[PDB]
Design a protein around this nucleic acid. Structure first.
Ligand SMILES: [Mg+2]
Ligand SMILES: [Mg+2]
Ligand SMILES: [Mg+2]
Ligand SMILES: [Mg+2]
Ligand SMILES: [Mg+2]
Ligand SMILES: [Mg+2]
Ligand SMILES: [Mg+2]
Ligand SMILES: [Mg+2]
Ligand SMILES: [Mg+2]
Ligand SMILES: [Mg+2]
Ligand SMILES: [Mg+2]
Ligand SMILES: [Mg+2]
Ligand SMILES: [Mg+2]
Ligand SMILES: [Mg+2]
Ligand SMILES: [Mg+2]
Ligand SMILES: [Mg+2]
Ligand SMILES: [Mg+2]
Ligand SMILES: [Mg+2]
Ligand SMILES: [Mg+2]
Ligand SMILES: [Mg+2]
Ligand SMILES: [Mg+2]
Ligand SMILES: [Mg+2]
Ligand SMILES: [Mg+2]
Ligand SMILES: [Mg+2]
Ligand SMILES: [Mg+2]
Ligand SMILES: [Mg+2]
Ligand SMILES: [Mg+2]
Ligand SMILES: [Mg+2]
Ligand SMILES: [Mg+2]
Ligand SMILES: [Mg+2]
Ligand SMILES: [Mg+2]
Ligand SMILES: [Mg+2]
Ligand SMILES: [Mg+2]
Ligand SMILES: [Mg+2]
Ligand SMILES: [Mg+2]
Ligand SMILES: [Mg+2]
Ligand SMILES: [Mg+2]
Ligand SMILES: [Mg+2]
Ligand SMILES: [Mg+2]
Ligand SMILES: [Mg+2]
Ligand SMILES: [Mg+2]
Ligand SMILES: [Mg+2]
Ligand SMILES: [Mg+2]
Ligand SMILES: [Mg+2]
Ligand SMILES: [Mg+2]
Ligand SMILES: [Mg+2]
Ligand SMILES: [Mg+2]
Ligand SMILES: [Mg+2]
Ligand SMILES: [Mg+2]
Ligand SMILES: [Mg+2]
Ligand SMILES: [Mg+2]
Ligand SMILES: [Mg+2]
Ligand SMILES: [Mg+2]
Ligand SMILES: [Mg+2]
Ligand SMILES: [Mg+2]
Ligand SMILES: [Mg+2]
Ligand SMILES: [Mg+2]
Ligand SMILES: [Mg+2]
Ligand SMILES: [Mg+2]
Ligand SMILES: [Mg+2]
Ligand SMILES: [Mg+2]
Ligand SMILES: [Mg+2]
Ligand SMILES: [Mg+2]
Ligand SMILES: [Mg+2]
Ligand SMILES: [Mg+2]
Ligand SMILES: [Mg+2]
Ligand SMILES: [Mg+2]
Ligand SMILES: [Mg+2]
Ligand SMILES: [Mg+2]
Ligand SMILES: [Mg+2]
Ligand SMILES: [Mg+2]
Ligand SMILES: [Mg+2]
Ligand SMILES: [Mg+2]
Ligand SMILES: [Mg+2]
Ligand SMILES: [Mg+2]
Ligand SMILES: [Mg+2]
Ligand SMILES: [Mg+2]
Ligand SMILES: [Mg+2]
Ligand SMILES: [Mg+2]
Ligand SMILES: [Mg+2]
Ligand SMILES: [Mg+2]
Ligand SMILES: [Mg+2]
Ligand SMILES: [Mg+2]
Ligand SMILES: [Mg+2]
Ligand SMILES: [Mg+2]
Ligand SMILES: [Mg+2]
Ligand SMILES: [Mg+2]
Ligand SMILES: [Mg+2]
Ligand SMILES: [Mg+2]
Ligand SMILES: [Mg+2]
Ligand SMILES: [Mg+2]
Ligand SMILES: [Mg+2]
Ligand SMILES: [Mg+2]
Ligand SMILES: [Mg+2]
Ligand SMILES: [Mg+2]
Ligand SMILES: [Mg+2]
Ligand SMILES: [Mg+2]
Ligand SMILES: [Mg+2]
Ligand SMILES: [Mg+2]
Ligand SMILES: [Mg+2]
Ligand SMILES: [Mg+2]
Ligand SMILES: [Mg+2]
Ligand SMILES: [Mg+2]
Ligand SMILES: [Mg+2]
Ligand SMILES: [Mg+2]
Ligand SMILES: [Mg+2]
Ligand SMILES: [Mg+2]
Ligand SMILES: [Mg+2]
Ligand SMILES: [Mg+2]
Ligand SMILES: [Mg+2]
Ligand SMILES: [Mg+2]
Ligand SMILES: [Mg+2]
Ligand SMILES: [Mg+2]
Ligand SMILES: [Mg+2]
Ligand SMILES: [Mg+2]
Ligand SMILES: [Mg+2]
Ligand SMILES: [Mg+2]
Ligand SMILES: [Mg+2]
Ligand SMILES: [Mg+2]
Ligand SMILES: [Mg+2]
Ligand SMILES: [Mg+2]
Ligand SMILES: [Mg+2]
Ligand SMILES: [Mg+2]
Ligand SMILES: [Mg+2]
Ligand SMILES: [Mg+2]
Ligand SMILES: [Mg+2]
Ligand SMILES: [Mg+2]
Ligand SMILES: [Mg+2]
Ligand SMILES: [Mg+2]
Ligand SMILES: [Mg+2]
Ligand SMILES: [Mg+2]
Ligand SMILES: [Mg+2]
Ligand SMILES: [Mg+2]
Ligand SMILES: [Mg+2]
Ligand SMILES: [Mg+2]
Ligand SMILES: [Mg+2]
Ligand SMILES: [Mg+2]
Ligand SMILES: [Mg+2]
Ligand SMILES: [Mg+2]
Ligand SMILES: [Mg+2]
Ligand SMILES: [Mg+2]
Ligand SMILES: [Mg+2]
Ligand SMILES: [Mg+2]
Ligand SMILES: [Mg+2]
Ligand SMILES: [Mg+2]
Ligand SMILES: [Mg+2]
Ligand SMILES: [Mg+2]
Ligand SMILES: [Mg+2]
Ligand SMILES: [Mg+2]
Ligand SMILES: [Mg+2]
Ligand SMILES: [Mg+2]
Ligand SMILES: [Mg+2]
Ligand SMILES: [Mg+2]
Ligand SMILES: [Mg+2]
Ligand SMILES: [Mg+2]
Ligand SMILES: [Mg+2]
Ligand SMILES: [Mg+2]
Ligand SMILES: [Mg+2]
Ligand SMILES: [Mg+2]
Ligand SMILES: [Mg+2]
Ligand SMILES: [Mg+2]
Ligand SMILES: [Mg+2]
Ligand SMILES: [Mg+2]
Ligand SMILES: [Mg+2]
Ligand SMILES: [Mg+2]
Ligand SMILES: [Mg+2]
Ligand SMILES: [Mg+2]
Ligand SMILES: [Mg+2]
Ligand SMILES: [Mg+2]
Ligand SMILES: [Mg+2]
Ligand SMILES: [Mg+2]
Ligand SMILES: [Mg+2]
Ligand SMILES: [Mg+2]
Ligand SMILES: [Mg+2]
Ligand SMILES: [Mg+2]
Ligand SMILES: [Mg+2]
Ligand SMILES: [Mg+2]
Ligand SMILES: [Mg+2]
Ligand SMILES: [Mg+2]
Ligand SMILES: [Mg+2]
Ligand SMILES: [Mg+2]
Ligand SMILES: [Mg+2]
Ligand SMILES: [Mg+2]
Ligand SMILES: [Mg+2]
Ligand SMILES: [Mg+2]
Ligand SMILES: [Mg+2]
Ligand SMILES: [Mg+2]
Ligand SMILES: [Mg+2]
Ligand SMILES: [Mg+2]
Ligand SMILES: [Mg+2]
Ligand SMILES: [Mg+2]
Ligand SMILES: [Mg+2]
Ligand SMILES: [Mg+2]
Ligand SMILES: [Mg+2]
Ligand SMILES: [Mg+2]
Ligand SMILES: [Mg+2]
Ligand SMILES: [Mg+2]
Ligand SMILES: [Mg+2]
Ligand SMILES: [Mg+2]
Ligand SMILES: [Mg+2]
Ligand SMILES: [Mg+2]
Ligand SMILES: [Mg+2]
Ligand SMILES: [Mg+2]
Ligand SMILES: [Mg+2]
Ligand SMILES: [Mg+2]
Ligand SMILES: [Mg+2]
Ligand SMILES: [Mg+2]
Ligand SMILES: [Mg+2]
Ligand SMILES: [Mg+2]
Ligand SMILES: [Mg+2]
Ligand SMILES: [Mg+2]
Ligand SMILES: [Mg+2]
Ligand SMILES: [Mg+2]
Ligand SMILES: [Mg+2]
Ligand SMILES: [Mg+2]
Ligand SMILES: [Mg+2]
Ligand SMILES: [Mg+2]
Ligand SMILES: [Mg+2]
Ligand SMILES: [Mg+2]
Ligand SMILES: [Mg+2]
Ligand SMILES: [Mg+2]
Ligand SMILES: [Mg+2]
Ligand SMILES: [Mg+2]
Ligand SMILES: [Mg+2]
Ligand SMILES: [Mg+2]
Ligand SMILES: [Mg+2]
Ligand SMILES: [Mg+2]
Ligand SMILES: [Mg+2]
Ligand SMILES: [Mg+2]
Ligand SMILES: [Mg+2]
Ligand SMILES: [Mg+2]
Ligand SMILES: [Mg+2]
Ligand SMILES: [Mg+2]
Ligand SMILES: [Mg+2]
Ligand SMILES: [Mg+2]
Ligand SMILES: [Mg+2]
Ligand SMILES: [Mg+2]
Ligand SMILES: [Mg+2]
Ligand SMILES: [Mg+2]
Ligand SMILES: [Mg+2]
Ligand SMILES: [Mg+2]
Ligand SMILES: [Mg+2]
Ligand SMILES: [Mg+2]
Ligand SMILES: [Mg+2]
Ligand SMILES: [Mg+2]
Ligand SMILES: [Mg+2]
Ligand SMILES: [Mg+2]
Ligand SMILES: [Mg+2]
Ligand SMILES: [Mg+2]
Ligand SMILES: [Mg+2]
Ligand SMILES: [Mg+2]
Ligand SMILES: [Mg+2]
Ligand SMILES: [Mg+2]
Ligand SMILES: [Mg+2]
Ligand SMILES: [Mg+2]
Ligand SMILES: [Mg+2]
Ligand SMILES: [Mg+2]
Ligand SMILES: [Mg+2]
Ligand SMILES: [Mg+2]
Ligand SMILES: [Mg+2]
Ligand SMILES: [Mg+2]
Ligand SMILES: [Mg+2]
Ligand SMILES: [Mg+2]
Ligand SMILES: [Mg+2]
Lengths: 275, 48
RNA sequence: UGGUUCGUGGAGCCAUGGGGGAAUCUGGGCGGACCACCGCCUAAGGCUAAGUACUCCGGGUGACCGAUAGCGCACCAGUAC
RNA sequence: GAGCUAGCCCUGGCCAGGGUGAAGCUGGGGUGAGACCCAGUGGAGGCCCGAACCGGUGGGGGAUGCAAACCCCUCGGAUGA
RNA sequence: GAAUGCCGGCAUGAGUAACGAUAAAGAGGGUGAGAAUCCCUCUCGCCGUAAGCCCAAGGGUUCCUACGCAAUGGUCGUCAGCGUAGGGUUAGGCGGGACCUAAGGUGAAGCCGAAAGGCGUAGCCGAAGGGCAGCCGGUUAAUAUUCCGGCCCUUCCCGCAGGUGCGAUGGGGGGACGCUCUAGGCUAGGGGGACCGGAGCCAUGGACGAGCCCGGCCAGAAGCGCAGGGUGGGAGGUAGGCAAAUCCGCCUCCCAACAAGCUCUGCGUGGUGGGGAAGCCCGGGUGACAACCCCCCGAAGCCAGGGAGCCAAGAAAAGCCUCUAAGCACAACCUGCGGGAACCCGUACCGCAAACCGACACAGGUGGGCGGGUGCAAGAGCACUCAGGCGCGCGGGAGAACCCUCGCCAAGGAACUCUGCAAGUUGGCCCCGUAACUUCGGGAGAAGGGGUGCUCCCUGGGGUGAUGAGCCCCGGGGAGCCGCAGUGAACAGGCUCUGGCGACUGUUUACCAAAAACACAGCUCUCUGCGAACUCGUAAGAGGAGGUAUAGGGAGCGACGCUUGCCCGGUGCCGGAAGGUCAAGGGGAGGGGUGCAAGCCCCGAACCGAAGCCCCGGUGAACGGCGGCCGUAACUAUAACGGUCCUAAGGUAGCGAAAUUCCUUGUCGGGUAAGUUCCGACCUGCACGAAAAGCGUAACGACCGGAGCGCUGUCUCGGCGAGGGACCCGGUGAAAUUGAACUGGCCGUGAAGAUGCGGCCUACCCGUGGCAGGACGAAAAGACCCCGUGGAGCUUUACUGCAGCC
RNA sequence: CGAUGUCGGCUCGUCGCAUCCUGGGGCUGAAGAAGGUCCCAAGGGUUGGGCUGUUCGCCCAUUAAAGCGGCACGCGAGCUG
RNA sequence: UGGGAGAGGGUGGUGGAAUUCCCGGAGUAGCGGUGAAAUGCGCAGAUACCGGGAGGAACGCCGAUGGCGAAGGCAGCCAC
RNA sequence: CCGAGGGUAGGGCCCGUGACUGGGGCGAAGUCGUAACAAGGUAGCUGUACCGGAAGGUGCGGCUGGAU
């Protein structure tokens, strides 16, 4: 339930911070953090390759367990639910009966003090991870592997879900968060339930400085630039685009499809996205 | 106001120094040039 | 595609990035598309003095300069700055 | 050539003093339970005033200058992009 | 002899400007060939959150002493950061290295690239971050946490004693962290004392005083005391920490819990070792057997890894501890003690500046720490002052114009002017009081007013301490005194109304623009299913992202409110397994050359044959576009209505003489005595209009218009006064410019604006202070403009290529 | 065009006369007063404000009157902007 | 106290008919629509027929002149 | 001391008046259409919403004051 502020400054008028009410542990597990090396959008030539990045709050990376078939059959207790600055979801700290501790993305409705488990035998309950071919059709699921044992790829942002549609040989069919229909190999793992922190989309930054805290430096418009810089540069006074709307590099940025036509995964996409 | 020359001994020796020059094809040519020309010094002096 | 005087030209010759791909003298290449005839030569392995080029250096010599000239420097100059 | 300047990265440091008084908490009132109301406490903010610090609004001087961008008065920001 | 030629030399301007902050000087006595300028004394003034002191960088002998004055020093010079010579920098503990890792750099393995080279895990390097043992005083002309004195401590080697499964680059613990606010107790620092120590002082009318003036400490091991940090103990199980593991991690049991206990710091005390003022006398010595005590204020520093709240969620690695593996248990490590061993480099001096960056001894620039006192509500603000440091390396006079900075002004009070530009006004605190409108926060310091000093009297609460006295912090009430005036000096808002633009705090053309421009939260379109799209790269590889559609790229719009209409014919993008055209290739009708002939060789029709393009549809918060003429109502006028032509469709809502309106100062209303501007309206909108968004909007603005009040030297209209210049004398002494000059006015003339030609008029020779009409004055080979088959940036359905993609 | 700074304002004048006022005249459809028109005359004078960058002009209140032009649209090594 | 009828209300679930869209098949010259038409759709293979998939909304017969509620109003079926 | 009142500054209510603008009433014989009364030729009315020269039209739900 997003939190509001009284209009005691111009910015506090619309700023809305998360409620944080589901978090139960306010500092991370030390054996599971490592420094997150900030890039500023710069590659290994040192060139800017992704504009408008940098100056965000310092962060530590939480190591997240995107496999879980690591420890088939070994139950774990949900110890805490924590804040992660590297992702939109919350994370859940598991204390395995192994004595081993790990982090998963926290699904919706998971509770501290509960048991989760992984493998083909697992119950169909929020937080358990199974091979897709064993989850009943119709189930909502998250943290889905895309190829077997390569790691969870799909539906990991706050609030997202994938829904199992049907089976076909070694492949189930998923409705991804984008609305697309895809065949995903049945031996890929996945976790029952949707990701938590669904209210994440209703946060209102409220002011410029907030964006800066996230590492988002100000994005300047092409129409505001000069012809050396951009297809929309120049003109005396303001100007309409005067050409098909383009990127800084010239390609058209309204409708122009860009997925590679001959891409080999095409044989497993069933239906492009929606809306 | 603040002017352009702001001396810095580490900076000087790391930018123009002998060891910088030798790590680069263009740096070696400089020394080959400056030795061919007969420069008394092949590199800026920094006190270190 | 490059080389050649040869800029696609009637365009051979030599070299080769790609594709197809032999034979051992009754084998093979060339004589400016191509064919016959007549000739020339023996590819897909290597080495080979000398005659040729240059002047950091040394000497010899000038219808070469003579301190604003002659090398940037006749002098503690690739210096001082 | 990034010892000026621009952006980012890593690691440190700095921001006198004063004013306003958000949420929350406590108590009180209210009600079926509430919302909510008052007082108290509380000390939020690209909040307010103002040095250091960062600026460079208006005007005057300077104009072979003290200075190849300075000086005086005045003015903006000053816990934050 | 000319090239705004090149190099050099010397002129002119000229004894001219200037001599670098208006913080400021005067005298006496020395020294010397020579003194405003050097040394000494006294007086005066300036800084004192510095203009004082300590670090770092940078500089590199500039430090100290003797001896000098040619040059340097904006004058002088006997002086000096100058010349010569000699001297001077002392560390196991301070900083750096023989330790650690961060970005980054480098790089066995590996990957890539015509060459040169590019990457790259580990590992290595890399600091002002982690870690680690020294404090007070004395001493030199010049070094001191370095030498010396006193009291402390670290590491390595070796030996002794006691103890223990010892053993590590391996496992684990720890190290280990943000922002804002903040408790308790301390310390640094300061204030006071009628108490303690002290050379003296009694002035000029009074005072021999509970008088004046000065000072009243600093460091210290073990131990003790106060205040804090850190930390559960035992057992059983175990599959996890890439071997093992008694360690850690998980589960269970018992016991302990705001504690205690153990451990680690800070403060205090502490054997001992030091310091010790004014004044007097020549840095010294006395003071002195110096005293070294009580009260208070009190940190932003200390205990620290303290506490609370918050979201934007806040390095690594070593030291250190613990676990075991090889090994080895004659070892080895742990603890206590003892002796021995302990290397390299820096250390001078300047360091907000005359020694660093600015060509200069340059009013500029330069990071960290200390920064005393009193009063002003507070403070690092302001004024004055302590310690300390300076009077800015040309002076002496004079008392013109004029210039700068400053002060005052009769009457008027914006009449000034593009504009109240500038300068006034206002000005702190406390109290009373405070409007439209509003997003309920605000608008607000609204506006407007009252108070403010000193004396005596009475009294309320807080802190320390003890509840008391003393000290100290907040008040309340009453009676009076003085002046023109009590934030008596210094620092310290003028206000209001109404438009345009932009929501807002922010950002920008370093050095002519700070804005309405950029950004901004939010809104919409669009791409992207992850070896993502996209971006840099030949590649490898990187960013995206150790992210995964609530995410990431691209585009426009730009808080919020109410809204965002019609056109898909053209261009773009999206979809379309048909049809049309389409290259290499396949195919081989049929021709051709040559040979005696097999053959060799060349051209070649149909037909099959991709993307693209055509064609068929979709699509506007994609590029874009949104009509003309004629007629019509029972006064007239005007047309709700109709006719027709064309379009892909003919501009909806809202707004409109506008940051847009040409005619234009449109017309009417407001405001003024008067209003090309301003506000409100009308609508024939030359040429608004709906995300290059339309119309509004509280609050905000060094933005840009209009009006009023207050108050003014802005003005009528000017006067006077101050200082720094200008002027005069002594010292030092530039500049651009310059064909040469013996260089007047008029009316003409001349390449059309003449000191220089003609005619006439006027005029003795040379300066000094001033003013700017001329020398088509200086400066810059016109930026405007044209020209050159000159150049560069930029655009696109110009041409032709290339990357890239298909 | 190897530079003649370009509107207006302010300041400071100065000249012309086709005279706006003041002086002297003739004619008048001049009774007087007040005008109209032309002649002579350049000695002196020729206001303060509102609007606009404005020149010009309109307006307000006055006046004897509120003149027209030249001097590089007089005057930026005099100022403004 | 013991009983009862009820589409009374809220929550979580869940079943079948039908329409539309997608996929495969099979099949061809029209379908749709109306007063009559036409726009539209269809040889780029529609309509009609079969199989499969997705998704939303409303609940046929029971059903009544019926029941419930203070009114607005409440209709598949299950449980709380 | 109080004090008629004068002065300055800021509020509240009421009345008059205002370029222009909004609808309203009324007005012997204007223009345009024909929405309602019959099933008024699409039954009507309704609350709301959107639209259009105008009456109105359409959507959604409701009423009979609806006709066969
Ligand atoms: Mg809010
Ligand atoms: Mg609110
Ligand atoms: Mg949460
Ligand atoms: Mg770690
Ligand atoms: Mg990275
Ligand atoms: Mg890199
Ligand atoms: Mg990018
Ligand atoms: Mg970036
Ligand atoms: Mg999170
Ligand atoms: Mg994310
Ligand atoms: Mg798969
Ligand atoms: Mg959002
Ligand atoms: Mg962040
Ligand atoms: Mg954004
Ligand atoms: Mg932008
Ligand atoms: Mg632009
Ligand atoms: Mg621009
Ligand atoms: Mg560029
Ligand atoms: Mg270009
Ligand atoms: Mg371009
Ligand atoms: Mg453009
Ligand atoms: Mg533009
Ligand atoms: Mg522009
Ligand atoms: Mg334009
Ligand atoms: Mg546009
Ligand atoms: Mg255009
Ligand atoms: Mg384009
Ligand atoms: Mg898709
Ligand atoms: Mg600078
Ligand atoms: Mg610097
Ligand atoms: Mg250095
Ligand atoms: Mg350094
Ligand atoms: Mg450096
Ligand atoms: Mg180097
Ligand atoms: Mg380098
Ligand atoms: Mg040498
Ligand atoms: Mg060099
Ligand atoms: Mg050739
Ligand atoms: Mg050839
Ligand atoms: Mg043979
Ligand atoms: Mg042969
Ligand atoms: Mg043969
Ligand atoms: Mg051959
Ligand atoms: Mg031959
Ligand atoms: Mg031949
Ligand atoms: Mg031959
Ligand atoms: Mg061979
Ligand atoms: Mg040879
Ligand atoms: Mg000769
Ligand atoms: Mg010579
Ligand atoms: Mg020579
Ligand atoms: Mg010569
Ligand atoms: Mg030579
Ligand atoms: Mg020479
Ligand atoms: Mg020399
Ligand atoms: Mg830099
Ligand atoms: Mg720099
Ligand atoms: Mg601050
Ligand atoms: Mg206040
Ligand atoms: Mg309060
Ligand atoms: Mg609280
Ligand atoms: Mg602020
Ligand atoms: Mg204030
Ligand atoms: Mg600046
Ligand atoms: Mg300035
Ligand atoms: Mg001013
Ligand atoms: Mg200048
Ligand atoms: Mg200044
Ligand atoms: Mg000032
Ligand atoms: Mg600010
Ligand atoms: Mg401020
Ligand atoms: Mg502040
Ligand atoms: Mg910050
Ligand atoms: Mg000549
Ligand atoms: Mg010459
Ligand atoms: Mg020349
Ligand atoms: Mg020359
Ligand atoms: Mg010369
Ligand atoms: Mg000479
Ligand atoms: Mg000379
Ligand atoms: Mg001469
Ligand atoms: Mg001379
Ligand atoms: Mg002169
Ligand atoms: Mg001068
Ligand atoms: Mg000077
Ligand atoms: Mg000064
Ligand atoms: Mg004297
Ligand atoms: Mg003197
Ligand atoms: Mg002297
Ligand atoms: Mg002398
Ligand atoms: Mg002096
Ligand atoms: Mg002296
Ligand atoms: Mg002081
Ligand atoms: Mg130097
Ligand atoms: Mg000398
Ligand atoms: Mg001398
Ligand atoms: Mg000498
Ligand atoms: Mg000198
Ligand atoms: Mg000097
Ligand atoms: Mg002497
Ligand atoms: Mg020394
Ligand atoms: Mg020592
Ligand atoms: Mg060693
Ligand atoms: Mg090389
Ligand atoms: Mg390094
Ligand atoms: Mg270090
Ligand atoms: Mg750290
Ligand atoms: Mg050390
Ligand atoms: Mg010590
Ligand atoms: Mg000595
Ligand atoms: Mg032991
Ligand atoms: Mg930690
Ligand atoms: Mg960490
Ligand atoms: Mg925070
Ligand atoms: Mg005090
Ligand atoms: Mg002590
Ligand atoms: Mg085990
Ligand atoms: Mg002493
Ligand atoms: Mg004694
Ligand atoms: Mg501090
Ligand atoms: Mg601490
Ligand atoms: Mg803490
Ligand atoms: Mg690391
Ligand atoms: Mg063994
Ligand atoms: Mg043994
Ligand atoms: Mg060594
Ligand atoms: Mg030293
Ligand atoms: Mg300074
Ligand atoms: Mg100095
Ligand atoms: Mg000086
Ligand atoms: Mg200086
Ligand atoms: Mg202080
Ligand atoms: Mg003191
Ligand atoms: Mg104060
Ligand atoms: Mg002075
Ligand atoms: Mg000074
Ligand atoms: Mg001076
Ligand atoms: Mg004089
Ligand atoms: Mg002054
Ligand atoms: Mg007076
Ligand atoms: Mg006056
Ligand atoms: Mg006035
Ligand atoms: Mg007045
Ligand atoms: Mg005015
Ligand atoms: Mg202006
Ligand atoms: Mg104005
Ligand atoms: Mg004041
Ligand atoms: Mg006041
Ligand atoms: Mg009002
Ligand atoms: Mg109000
Ligand atoms: Mg107002
Ligand atoms: Mg308003
Ligand atoms: Mg309000
Ligand atoms: Mg006030
Ligand atoms: Mg009073
Ligand atoms: Mg008094
Ligand atoms: Mg008095
Ligand atoms: Mg103020
Ligand atoms: Mg703006
Ligand atoms: Mg703005
Ligand atoms: Mg706007
Ligand atoms: Mg707005
Ligand atoms: Mg905005
Ligand atoms: Mg600028
Ligand atoms: Mg510029
Ligand atoms: Mg510049
Ligand atoms: Mg600008
Ligand atoms: Mg501004
Ligand atoms: Mg900008
Ligand atoms: Mg904005
Ligand atoms: Mg918006
Ligand atoms: Mg690229
Ligand atoms: Mg290459
Ligand atoms: Mg990554
Ligand atoms: Mg913007
Ligand atoms: Mg509103
Ligand atoms: Mg279209
Ligand atoms: Mg189209
Ligand atoms: Mg179309
Ligand atoms: Mg297409
Ligand atoms: Mg157009
Ligand atoms: Mg068009
Ligand atoms: Mg509309
Ligand atoms: Mg209009
Ligand atoms: Mg008008
Ligand atoms: Mg407008
Ligand atoms: Mg317009
Ligand atoms: Mg107009
Ligand atoms: Mg006009
Ligand atoms: Mg008018
Ligand atoms: Mg009027
Ligand atoms: Mg009109
Ligand atoms: Mg526009
Ligand atoms: Mg507004
Ligand atoms: Mg407003
Ligand atoms: Mg603003
Ligand atoms: Mg502004
Ligand atoms: Mg005004
Ligand atoms: Mg004056
Ligand atoms: Mg004077
Ligand atoms: Mg004289
Ligand atoms: Mg002289
Ligand atoms: Mg001299
Ligand atoms: Mg001559
Ligand atoms: Mg002459
Ligand atoms: Mg003469
Ligand atoms: Mg003359
Ligand atoms: Mg002429
Ligand atoms: Mg003439
Ligand atoms: Mg003459
Ligand atoms: Mg002549
Ligand atoms: Mg003559
Ligand atoms: Mg003549
Ligand atoms: Mg003559
Ligand atoms: Mg003559
Ligand atoms: Mg004459
Ligand atoms: Mg003179
Ligand atoms: Mg003169
Ligand atoms: Mg002149
Ligand atoms: Mg000339
Ligand atoms: Mg002249
Ligand atoms: Mg001239
Ligand atoms: Mg110039
Ligand atoms: Mg030029
Ligand atoms: Mg020229
Ligand atoms: Mg130009
Ligand atoms: Mg021209
Ligand atoms: Mg041409
Ligand atoms: Mg030509
Ligand atoms: Mg050209
Ligand atoms: Mg692309
Ligand atoms: Mg010209
Ligand atoms: Mg010239
Ligand atoms: Mg010139
Ligand atoms: Mg000119
Ligand atoms: Mg008469
Ligand atoms: Mg006459
Ligand atoms: Mg006259
Ligand atoms: Mg005018
Ligand atoms: Mg004119
Ligand atoms: Mg006019
Ligand atoms: Mg008269
Ligand atoms: Mg005139
Ligand atoms: Mg003219
Ligand atoms: Mg003209
Ligand atoms: Mg003129
Ligand atoms: Mg002029
Ligand atoms: Mg000028
Ligand atoms: Mg002018
Ligand atoms: Mg001039
Ligand atoms: Mg002049
Ligand atoms: Mg001139
Ligand atoms: Mg200007
Ligand atoms: Mg201007
Ligand atoms: Mg058809
Ligand atoms: Mg067919
Ligand atoms: Mg669906
Ligand atoms: Mg009364
Ligand atoms: Mg009276
Ligand atoms: Mg009629
Ligand atoms: Mg009808
Ligand atoms: Mg009807
Ligand atoms: Mg009808
Ligand atoms: Mg309709």
């Amino acid at each position: 339930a997003v939190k509001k502020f009284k209009p005691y400054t111009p910015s506090r008028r619309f700023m809305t911070v998360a409620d944080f009410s589901e978090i139960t542990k306010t500092e991370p597990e030390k054996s599971l953090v490592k420094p997150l090396k900030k890039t500023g959008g710069r590659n290994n030539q040192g060139r800017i390759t992704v504009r408008f990045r940098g100056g965000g709050h310092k962060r530590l990376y939480r190591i997240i367990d995107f496999k879980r078939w690591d420890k088939v059959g070994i139950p774990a207790k949900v110890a805490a639910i924590e804040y992660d600055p590297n992702r939109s979801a919350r994370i859940a700290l598991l204390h395995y009966v192994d004595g081993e501790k790990r982090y998963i993305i926290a699904p919706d409705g998971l509770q501290v003090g509960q048991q989760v488990v992984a493998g083909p035998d697992a119950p169909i309950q929020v937080g358990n991870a199974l091979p897709l071919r064993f989850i009943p059709v119709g189930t909502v699921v998250h943290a889905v592997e895309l190829e077997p044992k390569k790691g969870a790829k799909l539906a990991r942002a706050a609030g997202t879900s994938a829904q199992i549609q049907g089976r076909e040989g070694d492949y189930v069919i998923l409705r991804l968060p984008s609305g697309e229909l895809r065949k995903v190999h049945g031996e890929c793992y996945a976790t029952v339930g949707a990701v938590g922190n669904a209210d994440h989309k209703n946060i209102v930054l409220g002011k410029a400085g907030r964006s800066r805290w996230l590492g988002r430096r100000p994005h300047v418009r092409g129409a505001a630039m000069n012809p050396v810089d951009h297809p929309h540069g120049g003109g005396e006074g303001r100007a309409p685009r005067g050409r098909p709307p383009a990127s800084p590099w010239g390609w058209q940025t309204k409708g122009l499809k860009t997925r590679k036509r001959r891409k080999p995964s095409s044989r497993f996409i069933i239906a492009r996205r929606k809306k | 106001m603040k002017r352009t020359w702001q001396p810095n001994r580490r900076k000087r020796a790391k930018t123009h120094g002998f060891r910088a020059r030798m790590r680069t094809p263009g740096g070696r040519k400089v020394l080959k040039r400056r030795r061919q020309k007969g420069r008394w010094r092949l590199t800026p002096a920094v006190r270190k």
